[PDB]
């Protein structure tokens, strides 16, 4: 039942133990719990939110313990809310950890905390709701702001319910046939004006799936929207918070004719095929496949309408999900972004590194847009999406293709 002795951070370090931040990831990432309050987690703290526990089976927890290298008798020091700390203690006890304490001086020295360099780009429901009601909040939009739901095709679930004051974007407004690449600068200019977006409008996007919203977001960043943000974990986090919803067709938007800069203002954020091919086989650059493992080895193309199978030869595997519509390797059990530390280590093992020119691709770019926005928020400075992805690559039977099981070395 009970906790071992309380440890300070210093003692925990001396004893080669680990700290476990048991708050929701939003706060682990950098969001203050009160205005002006401590921002981020203790050095090398892990994040195991108590709110995830009901969606972690016994084996998911065991896996997570192993994966963070918690040795069974090495000290673990927990911090956060009491109920949360206690829920995690119970679970870790049942999983067989033997030295569980509280981190006594947790969050007591703000100057030593670590944060997602741009945590403010991944918002959470309560922040968004506070902003809407006119409450002073951390990282407040500098000027106008808009909330937009992004999904494939005309409004459906949006008609049933959506975040109050949210506009709606059909992803067909930003990408189109033949390659499912983004539409033209000129079509983008009109799309932006129509939804009342200028270069200095803060745009907060969410979707029923994070990647639809991310796709829109990366495209707006390319175009020239300076401040584009995602709801971390998407719509489901809003629904689950039991916050207010509105209903019915999207209300009329007041057009903004003049964007205020020439589009595109950030063209380096999107690569074509030749540019993508240029990144291969380099220490200072990575072309990253955000495709499932069966796509990566050539069991399946991932899509009904893509006949060719295999992968871009020399693409480094950035992980993804179980299939072409899932992103488990980037998600906590509640659907929010896994920790920066974990993502950084997963990518590192494949020689994908923040000092490189790094471009993400997948089938047609949605999954890659998602990892792009994470990497942006992790503070990766040279990131982009290779729009065409496997669909464009495998159009040309001259492009080199890899199949078969292979590891990190095989993409030098």
Applying the rule CB under 5 A, the residues between 226 and 255 that interact with Na ion are none
103, 273, 362, 373: which is the annotated catalytic residue?
A: 362
- Residue 92's CB: how many other CB atoms inside 10 A? 19
Comparison of 360 and 380: residue with beta carbon closer to Na ion: 360
Comparison of 356 and 364: residue with beta carbon closer to Na ion: 364
Query: Which of the ranges 8-16, 63-71, 178-186, 246-254 carries the binding residues for Na ion, by CB under 5 A?
Result: 178-186
**CB burial class (10 A; 0-12, 13-18, 19+) of residue 158?**
buried
Query: Phi-psi bin for 349: left (phi > 0), alpha (psi -120 to 50), beta?
Result: alpha
**384: which strand partners?**
359
Query: Which of the ranges 82-90, 176-184, 208-216, 395-403 carries the binding residues for Na ion, by CB under 5 A?
Result: 176-184
- Residue 187's CB: how many other CB atoms inside 10 A? 14
Binding mask of the shown chain, residues 335 to 374, with x at each position contacting Na ion by CB under 5 A: -----------------------------xx---------
Contact 343, 374 (CB under 8 A): yes
- Is 362 in the active site? yes
Comparison of 162 and 291: residue with beta carbon closer to Na ion: 291
Applying the rule CB under 5 A, the residues between 190 and 219 that interact with Na ion are none
Binding residues for Na ion, total number by CB under 5 A: 5
Q: How open is the CA angle 289-293-299, to the nearest 5 degrees?
A: 110
Contact 3, 102 (CB under 8 A): yes
CA atoms within 13 A on the CB side of 88: 28
Q: How far is the CB of 219 from Na ion (least distance, A)?
A: 10
- 157 alpha-carbon distance from chain centroid: 23
Per DSSP, 7 falls in state B
Comparison of 40 and 363: residue with beta carbon closer to Na ion: 363
Q: How far is the CB of 179 from Na ion (least distance, A)?
A: 6
Comparison of 234 and 365: residue with beta carbon closer to Na ion: 365
Asked if residue 390 binds Na ion (CB under 5 A), the reply is no
Residue selected from 119, 180, 259, 380 as contacting Na ion according to rule CB under 5 A: 180
- 140 alpha-carbon distance from chain centroid: 20
Comparison of 29 and 218: residue with beta carbon closer to Na ion: 218
Asked if residue 84 binds Na ion (CB under 5 A), the reply is no
Asked if residue 387 binds Na ion (CB under 5 A), the reply is yes
Q: How far is the CB of 125 from Na ion (least distance, A)?
A: 30
Query: Which of the ranges 11-19, 52-60, 177-185, 340-348 carries the binding residues for Na ion, by CB under 5 A?
Result: 177-185
Contact 336, 310 (CB under 8 A): no
Return d(Cα 31, Cα 41) in angstroms, integer: 10
Q: How far is the CB of 389 from Na ion (least distance, A)?
A: 5
Q: Binding site annotation covers 198?
A: no
Contact 236, 225 (CB under 8 A): no
Residue selected from 101, 181, 218, 289 as contacting Na ion according to rule CB under 5 A: 181
Question: How would you write 278-311 as a 3-class SS string?
Answer: CCCCCCCEEEEECCCHHHHHCCCCCCCCCCCCCE
Kindly list the catalytic residues: 362
List the binding residues for substrate.
367
- Which positions touch Na ion (CB under 5 A)? 180-181, 364-365, 387
List the binding residues.
367
């Amino acid at each position: 039942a009970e906790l071992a002795k309380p440890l300070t951070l210093d003692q925990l370090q001396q004893q080669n133990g680990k700290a476990i931040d048991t708050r929701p990831s939003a706060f682990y990432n950098g969001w203050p719990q009160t205005l002006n309050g401590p921002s981020g987690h203790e050095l090398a703290a892990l994040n195991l939110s108590a709110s995830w526990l009901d969606k972690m089976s016994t084996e998911q927890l065991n896996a997570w313990i192993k994966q963070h290298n918690l040795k069974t008798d090495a000290p673990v020091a927990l911090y956060g809310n009491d109920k949360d700390v206690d829920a995690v203690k119970t679970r870790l006890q049942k999983a067989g950890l033997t030295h569980i304490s509280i981190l006594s001086d947790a969050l007591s020295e703000p100057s030593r905390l670590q944060k997602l360099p741009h945590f403010e780009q991944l918002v959470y429901p309560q922040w968004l709701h506070d902003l809407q009601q006119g409450k002073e909040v951390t990282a407040k939009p500098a000027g106008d702001w808009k909330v937009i739901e992004a999904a494939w095709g005309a409004p459906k679930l949006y008609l049933i319910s959506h975040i109050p004051g949210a506009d709606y974007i059909d992803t067909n407004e930003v990408e189109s046939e033949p390659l499912w690449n983004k539409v033209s600068d000129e079509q983008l200019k009109a799309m932006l004006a129509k939804h009342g977006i200028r270069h200095d409008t803060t745009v907060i996007l969410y979707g029923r799936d994070v990647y639809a919203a991310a796709r829109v977001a990366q495209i707006m960043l390319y175009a020239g929207v300076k401040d584009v943000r995602l709801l971390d974990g998407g719509w489901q986090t809003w629904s689950d918070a039991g916050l207010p919803v509105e209903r019915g067709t999207p209300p009329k938007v007041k057009a903004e004719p003049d964007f205020g800069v020439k589009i595109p203002a950030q063209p380096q954020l999107m690569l074509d095929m030749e540019q993508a091919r240029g990144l291969l086989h380099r220490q200072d650059a990575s072309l990253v496949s955000i495709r499932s493992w069966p796509e990566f080895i050539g069991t399946t193309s991932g899509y009904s309408y893509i006949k060719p199978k295999g992968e871009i030869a020399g693409a480094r595997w950035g992980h993804a999900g179980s299939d072409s519509t899932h992103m488990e390797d980037f998600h906590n059990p509640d659907g929010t972004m896994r920790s920066a530390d974990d993502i950084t280590a997963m990518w590192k093992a494949w020689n994908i590194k923040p000092e490189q020119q790094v471009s993400f691709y997948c089938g047609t770019g949605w999954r890659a847009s998602e990892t792009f926005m994470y990497a942006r928020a992790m503070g990766w400075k040279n990131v982009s999406v290779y729009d065409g992805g496997w669909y464009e690559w495998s159009s040309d039977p001259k492009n080199p293709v890899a199949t078969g099981e292979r590891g990190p070395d095989s993409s030098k």
